[PDB]
Enzyme design. Structure first.
Site, PDB file in Angstrom:
ATOM      1  N   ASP A  80     -34.829 -41.314  12.696  1.00 54.87           N
ATOM      2  CA  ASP A  80     -36.106 -41.163  11.987  1.00 54.87           C
ATOM      3  C   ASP A  80     -37.287 -40.805  12.866  1.00 54.87           C
ATOM      4  OD1 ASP A  80     -34.472 -42.060   9.990  1.00 54.87           O
ATOM      5  OD2 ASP A  80     -35.822 -43.665   9.289  1.00 54.87           O
ATOM      6  N   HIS A 128     -41.366 -40.641  11.790  1.00 58.23           N
ATOM      7  CA  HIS A 128     -42.368 -41.515  12.395  1.00 58.23           C
ATOM      8  C   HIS A 128     -43.389 -40.704  13.178  1.00 58.23           C
ATOM      9  CE1 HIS A 128     -39.814 -45.474  12.262  1.00 58.23           C
ATOM     10  NE2 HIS A 128     -39.572 -44.698  11.218  1.00 58.23           N
ATOM     11  N   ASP A 187     -27.123 -38.153   8.333  1.00 60.84           N
ATOM     12  CA  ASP A 187     -27.810 -38.306   7.056  1.00 60.84           C
ATOM     13  C   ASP A 187     -29.272 -37.855   7.131  1.00 60.84           C
ATOM     14  OD1 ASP A 187     -28.332 -40.953   8.564  1.00 60.84           O
ATOM     15  OD2 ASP A 187     -29.776 -41.011   6.916  1.00 60.84           O
ATOM     16  N   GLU A 236     -32.792 -38.435   4.290  1.00 62.98           N
ATOM     17  CA  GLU A 236     -33.302 -38.817   2.994  1.00 62.98           C
ATOM     18  C   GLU A 236     -34.576 -38.035   2.683  1.00 62.98           C
ATOM     19  OE1 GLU A 236     -34.592 -42.943   2.466  1.00 62.98           O
ATOM     20  OE2 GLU A 236     -33.877 -42.874   0.385  1.00 62.98           O
ATOM     21  N   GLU A 271     -41.123 -35.946   4.813  1.00 61.43           N
ATOM     22  CA  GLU A 271     -41.524 -36.497   6.114  1.00 61.43           C
ATOM     23  C   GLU A 271     -41.019 -35.635   7.302  1.00 61.43           C
ATOM     24  OE1 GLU A 271     -40.331 -40.717   5.687  1.00 61.43           O
ATOM     25  OE2 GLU A 271     -42.432 -41.245   5.281  1.00 61.43           O
ATOM     26  N   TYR A 277     -38.252 -44.503  -7.120  1.00 55.36           N
ATOM     27  CA  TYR A 277     -38.095 -44.441  -5.665  1.00 55.36           C
ATOM     28  C   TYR A 277     -37.374 -43.169  -5.263  1.00 55.36           C
ATOM     29  CZ  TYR A 277     -39.407 -49.389  -5.119  1.00 55.36           C
ATOM     30  OH  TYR A 277     -40.074 -50.589  -5.151  1.00 55.36           O
TER      31      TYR A 277
END
Length: 720
Positions: free
Chosen positions: A471, A475, A547, A549, A553, A631
């Protein structure tokens, strides 16, 4: 054109971040070839052990596993999934039902390359070499390194290539092998043994699998059908053996023609052009120039590729999670993006409808009187980053009042000053969860997930796994956006430090050149998949592969990179980010956000409109938070920026998604997801989104004032 694969810089990040060596080392990596093990790559599983040896590595359209099984005859297991398994879950709250909540590939040994010498022993494993597009995997007889198989595993490869060395080839299946033809010899009475350099075999699976084994060494193979599932040679062999799944009879000669040339890797380049476009080029590395290469291509390749030096076949095979791949002939692919985003800092229409200006100003006032410490100094960098960016937007739109018409210079000043005060602790690496520079995988990592001895909690899920390289684009995108805005409005403010730090974050996610010797290249970007991966180092294996999601972002990271480029006058960075944003848009509508008619998913999955959590081996209509609709769809709707709203999220898709799913649930959502959903709604119905956004809760990375500003700057906004 201009070269896009150049360093951001070669600034030494050890000047800013305390140096560590990462505690979790790559066990099967050749450490002496001077190469960096990638953490978020499709080849990453190869470097580590996995639970029951089941971690898949997915070049596509072949799925590969290593030394899986009960130990009888371990080797390289091939799965080529013609069909998927679709399932669902019963509801847990009252929202309308979901038809297909997931899409998986069965774990089946379609075919496995092994050797008789490896009966009941555990072969040794090594990744000898690798690049962005490939890895050479060597399986050898334990403690006898002279007996081995090299597997050049390459993106899109139409065959599995196995260089046997002093080993007795064995081919097994979980299926029954129900026909064997050698060297196209049709009428032999012998049904037990077969000789030659070509073996066409069929399984009793459904639908029917047909594989062709080519032995390319000088000496012909002699195989015995030992039992219904095993073909076994009689003596050791040395040479290349290739096996390809035959999609249809009409393609056999194609596979015959392309058997002598295999990929060993590929070099990637990229350039911008004159007409505000960009392209990237893969030059496949091959063993020889005897014939041109045969390589399988994803759908977005087909829609973006230059057809002048490549030939399309009608040969197709299903990928694991990206729909049908189509074989292409040629040793060099050039993919083009001709319509790069025009989005910079602001909505394309910077000035809102006049009748809203006062409303927006009132809200912006309230928003700036927020407690910034409370909302930007969180337990973790992630939510801190969300807060920082949301306040950065307000500072930006107030300080571009010539364009935005939001004129209040005292407020502009206070917005920027508070933004700076909230941001400075991260700049100083003295936030709650500071960063470290990792000399092993060449990146930066949060302290929180590191071991106790390093001052961490020893929980690798801390900071959402940032310390194990999950991630980072997510971030660090927020921080890069905030930094770019500050440097845009105040170029001399802590200039050296701001630049070195921000660019360290950029380089950690998206270094494009090995001239940057401190950072791995393209940690979070995949030039073959044409999008980003989020999931990082996973001890015991990522059993469904890489993966991702959140698309917004990732988008927000590359938008941030673009903004940094603009703020520093770095044209190659700006154009690189633009190119990656374009490719992102393309693959987003091929695989992730599904318009009706999408050919890469079955109808009942397309009906979901978003893909959910996307893996290399499966797709799951859920979130890491839970299987809840607002969500699932909402995560793909924040953070809302001019890039997401003007360029990435098309009104057509928003419309389809709204009619199919969200319109029925939106008025009933009494949570911050309402703010997310209606700001998303402003893309197709700003006139009605606006009064809704006056009332509903905001996401923690969202402000009411910025929401109203984005809605009011829709050209089709009006008063109802």
């Amino acid at each position: 054109g201009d070269d896009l694969f150049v360093p951001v810089s070669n600034f030494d990040p050890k000047s800013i971040f305390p140096e560590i060596k990462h505690p979790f080392e790559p066990m099967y990596a050749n450490t002496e070839n001077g190469k960096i093990v990638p953490t978020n790559s499709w080849i990453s599983n190869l470097f580590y052990p996995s639970a029951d040896n089941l971690a898949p590595t997915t070049p596509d359209p072949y799925t590969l596993r290593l030394l899986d099984g009960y130990g009888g005859n371990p080797g390289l297991t091939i799965r080529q999934p013609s069909a998927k398994v679709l399932g669902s879950y019963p509801p847990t709250n009252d929202v309308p039902y979901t038809d297909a909540g997931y899409m998986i590939n069965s774990v089946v040994v379609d075919l496995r390359l092994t050797s008789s010498e490896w009966s009941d022993v555990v072969p040794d494993r090594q990744v000898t070499d690798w690049d962005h597009l490939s890895a050479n995997l060597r399986l050898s007889t334990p403690q006898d390194s002279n007996s081995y198989i090299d597997f050049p595993i390459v993106r899109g490869m139409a065959y599995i290539t196995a260089n046997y060395n002093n080993l007795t080839p064995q081919f097994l299946s979980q299926h029954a092998i129900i026909s064997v033809e050698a060297d196209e010899k049709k009428s032999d009475d012998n049904t037990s043994t077969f000789s030659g350099r070509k073996f066409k075999i069929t399984m009793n699976d459904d639908p029917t699998s047909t594989f062709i084994i080519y032995s390319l060494g000088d000496k012909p193979l002699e195989l015995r059908k030992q039992d219904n599932s095993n073909l076994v040679a009689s003596k050791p062999y040395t040479g290349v053996i290739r096996v390809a799944k035959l999609p249809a009879p009409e393609f056999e000669t194609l596979l015959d023609a392309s058997r002598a040339v295999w990929p060993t890797g590929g070099d990637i380049s990229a350039r911008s052009d004159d007409n505000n476009g960009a392209s990237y080029t893969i030059k496949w590395k091959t063993n020889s120039n005897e014939a041109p290469l045969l390589t399988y291509a994803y759908a977005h390749h087909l829609t973006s590729i230059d057809d002048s030096n490549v030939k399309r076949t009608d040969m197709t095979l299903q990928s694991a999670t990206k729909g049908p791949m189509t074989a292409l002939v040629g040793n060099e692919w050039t993919l083009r993006e001709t319509e790069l985003s025009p989005v910079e800092w602001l909505p394309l229409q910077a000035a809102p409808n006049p009748t809203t200006i006062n409303e927006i100003m009132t809200e912006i006032n309230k928003d700036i009187a927020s407690n910034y410490t409370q909302e930007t100094a969180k337990e973790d960098n992630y939510f801190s980053g969300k807060g920082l960016q949301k306040f950065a937007m307000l500072a930006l739109i107030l300080n571009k009042s010539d364009q935005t018409q939001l004129r209040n210079p005292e407020l502009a000043q206070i917005a920027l000053d508070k933004l700076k005060a909230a941001f400075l602790p991260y700049l100083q690496n003295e936030q709650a969860d500071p960063f470290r520079y990792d000399t092993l995988y060449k990146g930066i990592v949060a302290k929180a997930g590191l071991p106790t001895s390093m001052g961490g909690t020893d929980d690798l899920s801390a900071e959402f796994g940032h310390s194990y390289y999950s991630d980072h684009h997510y971030h660090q995108g927020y921080f890069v956006v905030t930094a770019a805005i500050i440097h845009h409005l105040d170029p001399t403010w802590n200039a050296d430090r701001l630049k070195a730090w921000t660019e360290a974050l950029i380089r950690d996610v998206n270094n494009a050149n090995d001239g940057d010797e401190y950072f791995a290249a393209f940690r979070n970007w995949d030039w073959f998949a044409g999008h980003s991966w989020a999931g990082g180092i996973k001890p015991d294996g990522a059993l469904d592969g890489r993966d991702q999601e959140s698309v917004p972002e990732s988008v927000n990271f590359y938008w941030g990179a673009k903004l940094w480029g603009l703020a520093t006058g770095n044209t190659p960075l700006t154009k690189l980010a633009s190119l990656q944003l374009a490719v992102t848009k393309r693959t987003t509508y091929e695989y992730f956000w599904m318009l009706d008619g999408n050919k890469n998913r079955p109808e009942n999955i397309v009906r979901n409109k978003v893909i959910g959590i996307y893996f290399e081996q499966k797709t799951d209509y859920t979130t890491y938070f839970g299987r809840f609709l607002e969500y699932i769809h909402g995560i793909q709707q924040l953070p809302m920026t001019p890039e997401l709203m003007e360029y990435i999220r098309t009104p057509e898709f928003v419309s389809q998604e709204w009619d199919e799913k969200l319109g029925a649930i939106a008025p009933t959502v009494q949570s911050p997801w309402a703010g997310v959903l209606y700001l998303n709604y402003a893309i197709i119905n700003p006139a009605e989104a606006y009064p809704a956004l006056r009332k509903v809760q905001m996401d923690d990375g969202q402000t009411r004032s910025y929401s109203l500003y984005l809605t009011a700057t829709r050209p089709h906004f009006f008063r109802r």
